Amino acid sequence: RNLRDLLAPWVPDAPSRALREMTLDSRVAAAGDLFVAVVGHQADGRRYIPQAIAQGVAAIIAEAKDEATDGEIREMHGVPVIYLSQLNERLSALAGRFYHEPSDNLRLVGVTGTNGKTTTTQLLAQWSQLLGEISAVMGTVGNGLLGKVIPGSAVDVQHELAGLVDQGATFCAMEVSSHGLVQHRVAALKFAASVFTNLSRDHLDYHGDMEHYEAAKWLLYSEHHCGQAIINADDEVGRRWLAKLPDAVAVSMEDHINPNCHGRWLKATEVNYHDSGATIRFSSSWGDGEIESHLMGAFNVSNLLLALATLLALGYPLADLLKTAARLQPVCGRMEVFTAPGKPTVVVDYAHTPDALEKALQAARLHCAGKLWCVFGCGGDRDKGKRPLMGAIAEEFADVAVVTDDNPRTEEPRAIINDILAGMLDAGHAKVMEGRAEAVTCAVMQAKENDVVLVAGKGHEDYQIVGNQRLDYSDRVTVARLLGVIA
């Protein structure tokens, strides 16, 4: 890494200097580093240029705004200080070149939208790896090769992607936040494909506001290397954008494919939601098929079809995708289904808010021929407001509400249960059982063969906090042992 080569596209004159790492933070800026001095959130990194020099940085790239002309080369204490206009906009391109263009050295798929980003990224990473890629994820769970995800600026993004390229990744599924896109955090990334899941924005009912929002987003999209566009046509904004993008792939499970356009498309024609997942029959411009999904609910059909359409658009053969679909797993503790011969279906989900609990029960209901059971509780020593709202949701969307403990901490466990029941029309209809393990056992052992039991609030968490004690406890392990299977 050399300052002169780094800046060659923008500053022909730049001096020769070996560079170690690239950093925005003057505190960790060490001997041989490139310090990048940006102006942002009422913060000016140029203030810290003297401190970075005193720590032996090899060179500095600084915002030109009010201090210098674009491309101006200065020298302080024998350290080159190069000023660039609009450095926030160019940081992605600068760090891309510094880290040897990692998005040009693997197949990068970006996923944007309010919901299903995490699941769609995991499905893309899992499916590509089943077809022979070494796959990685970048997102909210964390970054890393698949099965080794470890829990953020335009530099960090480029640095992390170069880390994955160095570990042998050939494929990366990246969650892209609306906030990341607007702050130019992925401005220079070469996306092989861009997936749009859906928009639950709200606050856009004035056609003036909907116009500006869209205008801002169209402008951003026009400036990125998006590659193949894959768009959920079951979203209203999705359809308006597909109307303007004749090369984009339209994906639907609700009959919104317009076949007159003669573009690329994929649509579920029928879904059977059963006790262990979904049978998805679909048509596409690539050919037709039937997938056996081990994921639960309508939203996970959508997420799976977006991942399928994306991998087809990148040229993965339909026959190989169909052969590997049954090996796609849920995100651990996200609508994770546990089935055993002649036992009720049990779903472990992390839902611990009223909206997540309603969504998990509506999803579970689609797979439920008999009665839907809901085992849940609320955390102690936290906001009490959700307690009656989660009671009312369990009473409405489940047939049997089993109220139990969930990390009661120092709070009287029964007091929490009382707050939950208070939100119900008929508390007497709720079943209460303390011991979480005992309440889970009660549901699982009493539920009929064609019932579904949703065990909500913990998902993947392997602890129950009682007092100051983090006790060893897993919903997944408890359910697995009762059903006679392995967690």
UniProtKB/Swiss-Prot annotation:
It is an enzyme of class 6 (ligase). GO terms for biological process: cell division; cell wall organization; peptidoglycan biosynthetic process; regulation of cell shape. One of its GO terms (molecular function) is ATP binding. The keyword Cytoplasm applies. The modification N6-carboxylysine is found at residue 217. A motif (Meso-diaminopimelate recognition motif) lies at residues 406-409. Keywords: ATP-binding, Cell cycle, Cell division, Cell shape, Cell wall biogenesis/degradation, Cytoplasm, Ligase, Magnesium, Nucleotide-binding, Peptidoglycan synthesis. Its cofactor is Mg(2+). Optimum pH is about 8. Catalyzes the addition of meso-diaminopimelic acid to the nucleotide precursor UDP-N-acetylmuramoyl-L-alanyl-D-glutamate (UMAG) in the biosynthesis of bacterial cell-wall peptidoglycan. Is also able to use many meso-diaminopimelate analogs as substrates, although much less efficiently, but not L-lysine. Pathway: Cell wall biogenesis; peptidoglycan biosynthesis. Belongs to the MurCDEF family. MurE subfamily. Its EC number is 6.3.2.13. Activated by potassium phosphate. It comes from the Bacteria. Its main location: cytoplasm. Transmembrane segments: none annotated. UDP-N-acetyl-alpha-D-muramoyl-L-alanyl-D-glutamate binds at residues 24, 26, 41-43, 177, 183, 185. This is UDP-N-acetylmuramoyl-L-alanyl-D-glutamate--2,6-diaminopimelate ligase. Carboxylation is probably crucial for Mg(2+) binding and, consequently, for the gamma-phosphate positioning of ATP. Meso-2,6-diaminopimelate binds at residues 382, 406-409, 457, 461. The keyword Acetylation does not apply. It is found in: Cytoplasm. ATP binds at residues 113-119.
